[PDB]
Amino acid sequence: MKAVQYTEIGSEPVVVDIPTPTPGPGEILLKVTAAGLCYSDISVMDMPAAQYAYGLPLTLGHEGVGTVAELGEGVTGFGVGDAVAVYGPWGCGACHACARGRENYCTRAADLGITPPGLGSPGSMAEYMIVDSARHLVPIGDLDPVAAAPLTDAGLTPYHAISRVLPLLGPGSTAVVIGVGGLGHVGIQILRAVSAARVIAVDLDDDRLALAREVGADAAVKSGAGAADAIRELTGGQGATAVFDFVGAQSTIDTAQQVVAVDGHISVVGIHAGAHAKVGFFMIPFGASVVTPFAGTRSELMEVVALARAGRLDIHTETFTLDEGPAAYRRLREGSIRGRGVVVPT
Amino acid sequence: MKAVQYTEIGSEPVVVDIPTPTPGPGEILLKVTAAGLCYSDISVMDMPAAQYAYGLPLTLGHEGVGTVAELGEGVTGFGVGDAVAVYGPWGCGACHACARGRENYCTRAADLGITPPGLGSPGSMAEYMIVDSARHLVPIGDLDPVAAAPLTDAGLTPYHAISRVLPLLGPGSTAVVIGVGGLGHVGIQILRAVSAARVIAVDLDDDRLALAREVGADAAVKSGAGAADAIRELTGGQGATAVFDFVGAQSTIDTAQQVVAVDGHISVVGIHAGAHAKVGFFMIPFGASVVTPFAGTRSELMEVVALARAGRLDIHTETFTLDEGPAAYRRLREGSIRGRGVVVPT
Amino acid sequence: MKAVQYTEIGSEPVVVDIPTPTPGPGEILLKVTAAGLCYSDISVMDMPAAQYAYGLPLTLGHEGVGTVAELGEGVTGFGVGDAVAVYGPWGCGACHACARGRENYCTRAADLGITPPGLGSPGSMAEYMIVDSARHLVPIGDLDPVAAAPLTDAGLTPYHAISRVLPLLGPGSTAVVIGVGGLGHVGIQILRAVSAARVIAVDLDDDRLALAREVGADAAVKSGAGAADAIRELTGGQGATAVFDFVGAQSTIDTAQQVVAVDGHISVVGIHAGAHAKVGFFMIPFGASVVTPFAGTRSELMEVVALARAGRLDIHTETFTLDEGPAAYRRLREGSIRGRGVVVP
Amino acid sequence: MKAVQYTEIGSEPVVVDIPTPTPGPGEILLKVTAAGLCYSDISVMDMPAAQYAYGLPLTLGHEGVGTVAELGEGVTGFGVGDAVAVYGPWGCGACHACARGRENYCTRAADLGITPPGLGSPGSMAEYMIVDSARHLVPIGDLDPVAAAPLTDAGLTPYHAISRVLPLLGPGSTAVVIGVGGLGHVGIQILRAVSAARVIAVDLDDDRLALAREVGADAAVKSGAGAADAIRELTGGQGATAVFDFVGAQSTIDTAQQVVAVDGHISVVGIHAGAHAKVGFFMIPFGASVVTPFAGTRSELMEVVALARAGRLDIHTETFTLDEGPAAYRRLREGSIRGRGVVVPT
Numbered sequence A, B, D: 001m002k003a004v005q006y007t008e009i010g011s012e013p014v015v016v017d018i019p020t021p022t023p024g025p026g027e028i029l030l031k032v033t034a035a036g037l038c039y040s041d042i043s044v045m046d047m048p049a050a051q052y053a054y055g056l057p058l059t060l061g062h063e064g065v066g067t068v069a070e071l072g073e074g075v076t077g078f079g080v081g082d083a084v085a086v087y088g089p090w091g092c093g094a095c096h097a098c099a100r101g102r103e104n105y106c107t108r109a110a111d112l113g114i115t116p117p118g119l120g121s122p123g124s125m126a127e128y129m130i131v132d133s134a135r136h137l138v139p140i141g142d143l144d145p146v147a148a149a150p151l152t153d154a155g156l157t158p159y160h161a162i163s164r165v166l167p168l169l170g171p172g173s174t175a176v177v178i179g180v181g182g183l184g185h186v187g188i189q190i191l192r193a194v195s196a197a198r199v200i201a202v203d204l205d206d207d208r209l210a211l212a213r214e215v216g217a218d219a220a221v222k223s224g225a226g227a228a229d230a231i232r233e234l235t236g237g238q239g240a241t242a243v244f245d246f247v248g249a250q251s252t253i254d255t256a257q258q259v260v261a262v263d264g265h266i267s268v269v270g271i272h273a274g275a276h277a278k279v280g281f282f283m284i285p286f287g288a289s290v291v292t293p294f295a296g297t298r299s300e301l302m303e304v305v306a307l308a309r310a311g312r313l314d315i316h317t318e319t320f321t322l323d324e325g326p327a328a329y330r331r332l333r334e335g336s337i338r339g340r341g342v343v344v345p346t
Numbered sequence C: 001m002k003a004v005q006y007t008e009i010g011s012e013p014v015v016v017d018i019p020t021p022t023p024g025p026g027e028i029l030l031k032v033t034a035a036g037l038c039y040s041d042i043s044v045m046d047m048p049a050a051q052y053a054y055g056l057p058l059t060l061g062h063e064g065v066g067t068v069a070e071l072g073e074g075v076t077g078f079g080v081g082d083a084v085a086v087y088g089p090w091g092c093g094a095c096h097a098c099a100r101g102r103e104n105y106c107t108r109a110a111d112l113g114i115t116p117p118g119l120g121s122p123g124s125m126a127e128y129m130i131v132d133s134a135r136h137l138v139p140i141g142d143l144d145p146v147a148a149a150p151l152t153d154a155g156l157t158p159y160h161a162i163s164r165v166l167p168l169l170g171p172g173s174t175a176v177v178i179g180v181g182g183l184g185h186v187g188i189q190i191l192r193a194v195s196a197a198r199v200i201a202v203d204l205d206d207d208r209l210a211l212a213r214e215v216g217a218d219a220a221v222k223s224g225a226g227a228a229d230a231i232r233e234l235t236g237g238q239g240a241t242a243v244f245d246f247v248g249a250q251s252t253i254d255t256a257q258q259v260v261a262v263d264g265h266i267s268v269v270g271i272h273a274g275a276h277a278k279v280g281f282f283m284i285p286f287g288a289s290v291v292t293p294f295a296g297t298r299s300e301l302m303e304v305v306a307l308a309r310a311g312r313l314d315i316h317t318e319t320f321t322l323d324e325g326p327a328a329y330r331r332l333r334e335g336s337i338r339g340r341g342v343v344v345p
């Protein structure tokens, strides 16, 4: 087998029966124990035919954890039964970025026909999944799979975004988190674990602001036209050292530019087509850098797993069966999952 | 004493006779040996009455070198006759940024009424000038004052911009320099001295491309619509690790976005009101950060001076008298100074 | 004031009456609200006549907080009544290190005759004290002075030592803290606040191990011959990413070398004359760097103050009067102050 | 095939005929084009029987370049004929260090029985060699193999040592290089290429001081009792920002401690059993860190190759045949190779 696939442009994903794959040389077959739903899946399924490039059908799910079921020829660095998380943004493994584990920034992958699981290659929303190479597996030991699956993107992506500017986030700093969803609720917790920043969370929804306080935000601010003034009141007029925008709409990016401090940072993490920061003199403070980060690195995924194993990340989830996969995507689309949706096969 | 002042909104600067100042407690009086002209002075003098905030009259010149003439009460660490460069972007000296020498990013200066020489306080285009505090002087020893004056902004600003991302500029990297004027011709030389980056220079003017090659650029490319494709051809389709845009027009920022590499950097250094980078998904590569840097730090100015003393910077200048100051500004406006204009008071 | 001074080589410090100073141009007079005792004061007072270089008499105390009492001529940026901490390791203010606020690493100060309060210039163990320049004052707002005074060295020094290698201390890292005294008990708390490192504390004294657990250590291990094996058991045989040795005896440095990981770090912070790490092939792991850090930077002191104001540092103190100053030093010498001794004028 | 092997404890290496190997799955067979001699080979061959752990016989050579001769089953990313350099310090590929390319600091390799070529596995001093995995090959394009072979250790090791502290080596800094041999003569050139440090070279031999000046040292100091005072005279009494000791004898480490600046660095790179820095209060300046670095990282090797391709490294070599291999080791032992000895098979 059972899997959840995107099969027709503009249609909802469907539950299918397809062959259980067998690993070729160097590949590993996992029995999937948990598969996370990411809002990027919604954006992908909303692409018109002219833009959509991942092929049909596509087994969804780029947040995957499992146990090693079968080793392909020549694979010996894992044993059958090992609990592993899948490193998602597969790169070529050979370029200068990849040599540093920064496969998220590989520029050679596309030309070599290397695509990530759930985003061009078959994903984790299935009873079993293939992983191309052992370097794309990270051990998780006895971590609960349901809470582990989101670490692979909801954890990894905020972790990487924060890591890019961690030296800015010393005692006395303030970090703003915009969007307390799958990514944002983990982002707050990463900030608390790896920095002494004061954390201000921003969301449209009072229940998400409650979630933010539950996971350790120091303050919670309603998003929209009043947010910039409210944040500036909290920061004593100086603004926020860093803003991590997990929404990335034009309104939230505007809020971010209106509150960022001199020599601070805006990380535009959320993906809303057309929205952008306007980085120019008189439009942003001196020295305030802006970036659109993507995914994270191999060693960053290991660090996220280490945070989880140390008890520093309380991942808020709701569990679904494979048969409930399409229903779960409807819930994600409408904004009614408090945290991360996770499919648990069987 | 003789000085060059901006005295009337919309009018050319004029040569004046005003009193030689006397240093109060903590201040230092310099006999000016060289005063650099910066294109920012043109932009300032082009501001309409409603925007112009630096007061009239204003003695111009924020690139200053001199010899210590008189010590104000309680000043130590300098003797009469010492050759010094003036650190330009005065801050409060007390905040967290200033404590690190990063007075360029002080947020307290404005509210305390602290303004820089030539940009709210009296500048260096005069026989003598006041410096507010000893911490705003850096010794230059026997460096030629004419070539030293530009170090204080034409050197400092590119040096800071490059320093923000120096770890990116390893062997195999490429740095693009857009605009081979006062700042840009120094920026090329800094890149060559402190990194192993391949340097590609870009300018509208073929004589400035020649200047770029003279000061060590590896390649020089005509600016305009064909520049992005030409740069991409030189970088093997991978793009440039970093782009230092010393023009900052919309067209040059667009060129920068079209050539920057994944996980690279654009530094928008030149100031053209309204121009901005558009930093959003699908509009810039993943991981490519963008910033508008401002001036530089105390320790950075010392490092620039150290480069000059080591013979690493060939500063291209043309010398003017104080009486020629207004004529020199006309030359700067029309683009006919090959490098930096420098006034030498007699 | 009344002051406590070291007055005679080899003798205990004494309570004295000396003139209240007046600030000259650029100086600030503080009314002292709290003055910390540091174990370095013991080491200084144990120096023989041939080594001791700070002059007699010396008003002790290089951990100082106060309120601005008088401004010297030309001083700006502070008002009378402002609560401030004194930045201790005064530098020249002009060199490349000082320009970055790294006055702790100034090499010009000695030749210019610049000495720190309590260590060549008059210290904070007195009703009033002089500060040379406004850049050596950091505002503390409404922070309790008793808990604030130790921030200026018990806080600053561990903070700097940790900061030198903070990028190593990611999730999955382990930091060992040897010596849970004035410095060490703050070091544990800094590690918890600014990193995700697992913290293993080491001390001779079971009550100090309890203190370590109270302030957030993940494990606390008895020092001595068994400590290295115990630490290696806790780290799965891989050793510790960083070791912060706040004792710095040969035995503790040896423990540090026996537990540090490949590509890790040993910070020798505690001062024991003659003791040293042996950094050579076959004697330490590949890539494991070793340093003796000193004090900290201007911006680091500001950051320490920010941690305290945010409630991230529970500074364990015992309070003494000026008259009790000599008794407090005897207590420090014998090891009976649980945390930091602080004199309140 | 012909090879040079260490075959008997305490005896000179010998030229042998042994079978040409065949690559198994994931392995690559190279036709060797150049094999560097490293002084570590001398130290290894001087180990008594009780210490020597690399097995007999051992094909020597841990500096290897070649062309791809045969691909083992499942190998991708290289074609037959590709010119490649061998990354020497093989790690497990999977741990946190290896995920960052830092296989030089892998702690899992020993327990997994992973040993480097020339140092437990068969080396490059042979007509052909096996490489275990594609990730241990770096393309060199048309670089001359003779000058390329030393990049793999004589280049890599100094490059890594310098890289650990590159942010210290700003304009105005001084770097001391002790020992102008295989590693040291490359170290000087790396410092000149990637920093603005003033470079002071130190050697016992006047001809090696001449070599140092030939490759870009600013100053040259005779090693021994007068070296520390001479270096301090050159640095104005302040001492050297960093000392890279490629000898690592007690006398050179003592020199390094006597000249290092406050908040500087000593890198003990050369290996002399028993010698060590004494890092304690009153024995070294405040803030001066000391480390024994080992080899370098995957991305560092790529950077070294990039320096060579850009013309930044003039590698001084002497060429030997395989039959001359033992004679070349005698020359290395006696100190008569001016730079790096390189064996060029058939």
Ligand SMILES: NC(=O)c1ccc[n+]([C@@H]2O[C@H](COP(=O)([O-])OP(=O)(O)OC[C@H]3O[C@@H](n4cnc5c(N)ncnc54)[C@H](O)[C@@H]3O)[C@@H](O)[C@H]2O)c1
Pocket: A037, A038, A039, A040, A041, A043, A153, A154, A157, A178, A179, A180, A181, A182, A183, A184, A202, A203, A204, A205, A208, A223, A224, A246, A247, A248, A249, A251, A252, A268, A269, A270, A271, A272, A292, A293, A294, A295, A332, A335, A339
């Ligand atoms: N850059 C990357 O590599 C990367 C990786 C993964 C996901 N993403 C993107 O991150 C974004 C978030 O993904 P998710 O799975 O956490 O989404 P989610 O649907 O789980 O959460 C969205 C959250 O944002 C809040 N929100 C929406 N509009 C808002 C506004 N105007 N102001 C404040 N809050 C607002 C919602 O109320 C909700 O709490 C998506 O755009 C996704 O595509 C990016």
Ligand SMILES: NC(=O)c1ccc[n+]([C@@H]2O[C@H](COP(=O)([O-])OP(=O)(O)OC[C@H]3O[C@@H](n4cnc5c(N)ncnc54)[C@H](O)[C@@H]3O)[C@@H](O)[C@H]2O)c1
Pocket: B037, B038, B039, B040, B041, B043, B153, B154, B157, B178, B179, B180, B181, B182, B183, B184, B202, B203, B204, B205, B208, B223, B224, B246, B247, B248, B249, B251, B252, B268, B269, B270, B271, B272, B292, B293, B294, B295, B332, B335, B339
């Ligand atoms: N960010 C800061 O802190 C800071 C500090 C100093 C100066 N500036 C700004 O930097 C800019 C440069 O100042 P300068 O004094 O070196 O100027 P300048 O007049 O000396 O040099 C301008 C150069 O840019 C070239 N140029 C102009 N338009 C171009 C285009 N479209 N493409 C390529 N080249 C082009 C010119 O031919 C000339 O060589 C100005 O905008 C100035 O205000 C900024």
Ligand SMILES: NC(=O)c1ccc[n+]([C@@H]2O[C@H](COP(=O)([O-])OP(=O)(O)OC[C@H]3O[C@@H](n4cnc5c(N)ncnc54)[C@H](O)[C@@H]3O)[C@@H](O)[C@H]2O)c1
Pocket: C037, C038, C039, C040, C041, C043, C153, C154, C157, C178, C179, C180, C181, C182, C183, C184, C202, C203, C204, C205, C208, C223, C224, C246, C247, C248, C249, C251, C252, C268, C269, C270, C271, C272, C292, C293, C294, C295, C332, C335, C339
């Ligand atoms: N590097 C610097 O700039 C700097 C600055 C300030 C203080 N110091 C030094 O730091 C050291 C500590 O100062 P303090 O004021 O915190 O001392 P303290 O007397 O308050 O505490 C000492 C602690 O170390 C423990 N201890 C002693 N020997 C031990 C051993 N062998 N193993 C484990 N634990 C042991 C004690 O039980 C006690 O808890 C002193 O040497 C002091 O001079 C250094």
Ligand SMILES: NC(=O)c1ccc[n+]([C@@H]2O[C@H](COP(=O)([O-])OP(=O)(O)OC[C@H]3O[C@@H](n4cnc5c(N)ncnc54)[C@H](O)[C@@H]3O)[C@@H](O)[C@H]2O)c1
Pocket: D037, D038, D039, D040, D041, D043, D153, D154, D157, D178, D179, D180, D181, D182, D183, D184, D202, D203, D204, D205, D208, D223, D224, D246, D247, D248, D249, D251, D252, D268, D269, D270, D271, D272, D292, D293, D294, D295, D332, D335, D339
């Ligand atoms: N740390 C590592 O990862 C690593 C890697 C490779 C090599 N090494 C070691 O680096 C060292 C250098 O190797 P190499 O192949 O360049 O050696 P080499 O024999 O080619 O060069 C030695 C050089 O050091 C000089 N020298 C010797 N004694 C000296 C002294 N007392 N003072 C000043 N100069 C002196 C010689 O005159 C010669 O120029 C060796 O100990 C080697 O084992 C270490």
Ligand SMILES: C[C@@H](CCC(=O)O)C(=O)O
Pocket: A038, A040, A041, A043, A044, A062, A119, A153, A271
């Ligand atoms: C479609 C989207 C996927 C991001 C993700 O991995 O969540 C992207 O490629 O930008």
Ligand SMILES: C[C@@H](CCC(=O)O)C(=O)O
Pocket: B038, B040, B041, B044, B062, B119, B153, B271, B295
């Ligand atoms: C007025 C202008 C001055 C920049 C400069 O210092 O050259 C600015 O601050 O934007």
Ligand SMILES: C[C@@H](CCC(=O)O)C(=O)O
Pocket: D038, D040, D041, D043, D044, D062, D119, D153, D271, D295
């Ligand atoms: C013998 C030495 C080898 C270093 C090298 O690779 O040159 C070591 O591993 O200790």
Ligand SMILES: [Zn+2]
Pocket: A038, A039, A040, A041, A062, A153
């Ligand atoms: Zn996703």
Ligand SMILES: [Zn+2]
Pocket: A091, A092, A093, A094, A095, A096, A097, A098, A103, A106, A107, A108, A109
């Ligand atoms: Zn790649």
Ligand SMILES: [Zn+2]
Pocket: B038, B039, B040, B041, B062, B153
């Ligand atoms: Zn300017």
Ligand SMILES: [Zn+2]
Pocket: B091, B092, B093, B094, B095, B096, B097, B098, B103, B106, B107, B108, B109
């Ligand atoms: Zn300031």
Ligand SMILES: [Zn+2]
Pocket: C038, C039, C040, C041, C062, C153
């Ligand atoms: Zn102390």
Ligand SMILES: [Zn+2]
Pocket: C091, C092, C093, C094, C095, C096, C097, C098, C103, C106, C107, C108, C109
């Ligand atoms: Zn100084």
Ligand SMILES: [Zn+2]
Pocket: D038, D039, D040, D041, D062, D153
């Ligand atoms: Zn070697």
Ligand SMILES: [Zn+2]
Pocket: D091, D092, D093, D094, D095, D096, D097, D098, D103, D106, D107, D108, D109
């Ligand atoms: Zn490994």
